[PDB]
Copies of this chain bind each other. A is one copy, B any other.
């Protein structure tokens, strides 16, 4: 037993990380088959980052202005192109460690693993959620740009995130691997801020089920409620609305415990109203919202990769 913030094993992604250098700027790239993927802002200086014309800046660039190290080995760039906010550098060598993979776009509330890297060197792995305000509460020091987020299903790596920038508030913003931003952010040094964030209700409920499965049972009560009654409480405490689809997704956990989702919603209502009264749940004084229903089932079942 036990319950921990758990990342996917990062080995399939470690073998894809490379260093990309454009003159003075160095950051991380993702080498899959014969293409390296990295943030397009790699082509910008201090001058440029204020108001960049990317199509213009890029049309200036020799293939040879892109220095690409896979560990201690040079890669020959034979092509450059943009898709939205990512730069695609075609190279002469396919990555022999290319895993089975795909590019997918996640919904806010979904979780993924981030391999933090510095100069194409993987440094650490942590588990994140896409916030309702489309930011991630990451740990990134300068040169982590181009670090990626992924999920693993069986043998297949699903890449969902590439890190572009930190917001003034401490949190992080980036794109899918097709270079589409998560949230209303642009790759430019302008005034940009996070919107007011909210709590991921369906995730808090998943984590209450994890606590019950682990023997932490004190917050359960005899009461039930309704979606309408609960959502009036959710809205009041800056919680995401709970939809019928959320209830359906928690179905299995409600079967395995005996606690109907609106039964557990009654528990969460009381925790929002009265607090936790000096107690903890799974060694936490806060209601954690970065575990999905699937995260709770997978960790409390034993699924491997």
Contact = CB atoms under 8 A, between A and B. Distances in A.
Interface of A: 1-12, 14-15, 115-119, 121-126, 128, 137-144, 166, 170-172, 214-215, 280, 283-286, 299-305
17 contacts: A1-B166, A1-B170, A2-B138, A2-B140, A4-B137, A6-B126, A8-B124, A8-B125, A9-B11, A11-B14, A121-B305, A122-B304, A125-B125, A141-B301, A143-B302, A284-B286, A285-B285
A142 B1 CA distance: 8
Question: How would you classify the secondary structure of chain A's contact residues: helix, strand, loop or mixed?
Answer: loop
Contacts of A137: 2, 4, 283
B141 A302 contact: yes
A8 B116 CA distance: 10
Contacts of A14: 9, 11
A15 B11 contact: yes
A282 to B, nearest CB: 10
Given A5-B5, A123-B305, A283-B286, 20 more contacts: A1-B139, A2-B138, A2-B172, A4-B137, A4-B139, A5-B126, A6-B124, A7-B7, A7-B124, A7-B125, A9-B10, A9-B124, A11-B122, A122-B304, A139-B299, A141-B299, A142-B302, A170-B214, A284-B285, A285-B285
